[PDB]
Amino acid sequence: MGGFGLKNPPPQILIKNTPVPADPPTQFSSQKINSFITQYSTGQMTVEIEWELRKENSKRWNPEIQYTANFNNSANAQFSVNNNGLYIEDRTIGTRYLTHTL
Amino acid sequence: SMFMHNQALDRLMNPLVDQYLWYLDATSGNNLTFRKAGAKNFPEYFRNWIPGPGCRNQQWNKVGTKNNPQTGTWASANKWRLQGRLNKYAPGQPNAPAEGFL
Numbered sequence: 001m002g003g004f005g006l007k008n009p010p011p012q013i014l015i016k017n018t019p020v021p022a023d024p025p026t027q028f029s030s031q032k033i034n035s036f037i038t039q040y041s042t043g044q045m046t047v048e049i050e051w052e053l054r055k056e057n058s059k060r061w062n063p064e065i066q067y068t069a070n071f072n073n074s075a076n077a078q079f080s081v082n083n084n085g086l087y088i089e090d091r092t093i094g095t096r097y098l099t100h101t102l
Numbered sequence: 103s104m105f106m107h108n109q110a111l112d113r114l115m116n117p118l119v120d121q122y123l124w125y126l127d128a129t130s131g132n133n134l135t136f137r138k139a140g141a142k143n144f145p146e147y148f149r150n151w152i153p154g155p156g157c158r159n160q161q162w163n164k165v166g167t168k169n170n171p172q173t174g175t176w177a178s179a180n181k182w183r184l185q186g187r188l189n190k191y192a193p194g195q196p197n198a199p200a201e202g203f204l
Contacts, residue, residue: 028119 017041056098065097111151112144123148156195161203 022035069078070090076082078090120140127137127146139146160178163169172178180191 030119030122 058098058100060099064099067093067097111153112147112149114149114151115144115147117142121147154195156197159194159197159199161199163203165202 017039020037020039021033022037024033076088079088081087120138123139124136125139125146126134128135137146139148157180159180160175162175176190180194181188182191183189
């Protein structure tokens with residue numbers, strides 16, 4: 001599907017709500033505790049990647065194909081939110097534009 | 103040891119919770135039925151320890167009218183023999199007699 005094959009990829013990160021049981025009966029029972037307190041959780045996360053990139057030196061004379069926002073006027077701008085508040089991606093943008101000698 | 107015990111052997115346990123050990127109570131009906139140890143039925147509990155050694159000994163009631171009229175007590179005694187001659191076994195293991203007997 002494309003990508004970087006890794007022997008030792010980034011570690012999976014797993015999270016759970018710790019169970020909080022509801023009021024236990026007064027008499028003892030060895031069976032599992034069936035009833036819990038309904039709860040959920042929320043909070044912010046952050047991810048910081050450091051990328052290394054190969055600089056481009058090409059002596060070709062004439063200009064190259066490059067990615068350009070659609071030149072057309074439109075009811076909704078490209079890669080932007082609409083009236084209802086929904087973010088819309090216009091395309092899939094490949095990485096291959098700049099030419100290189102074979 | 104200057105102390106008298108606070109508990110019987112067979113009585114060492116928690117009465118409030120039943121054991122997790124299972125035994126065969128009943129064979130009736132061409133099938134095997136496994137009861138669970140508990141429900142305040144003590145004789146069925148499993149135990150780690152068992153009472154001390156001893157031997158049965160003749161018991162004479164402290165009220166003379168209730169005793170068999172033996173002209174002397176030898177043939178009724180507990181005896182151990184050594185080198186072909188019989189010696190009374192006294193005192194035996196520390197076994198107590200019935201209440202009101204000796």
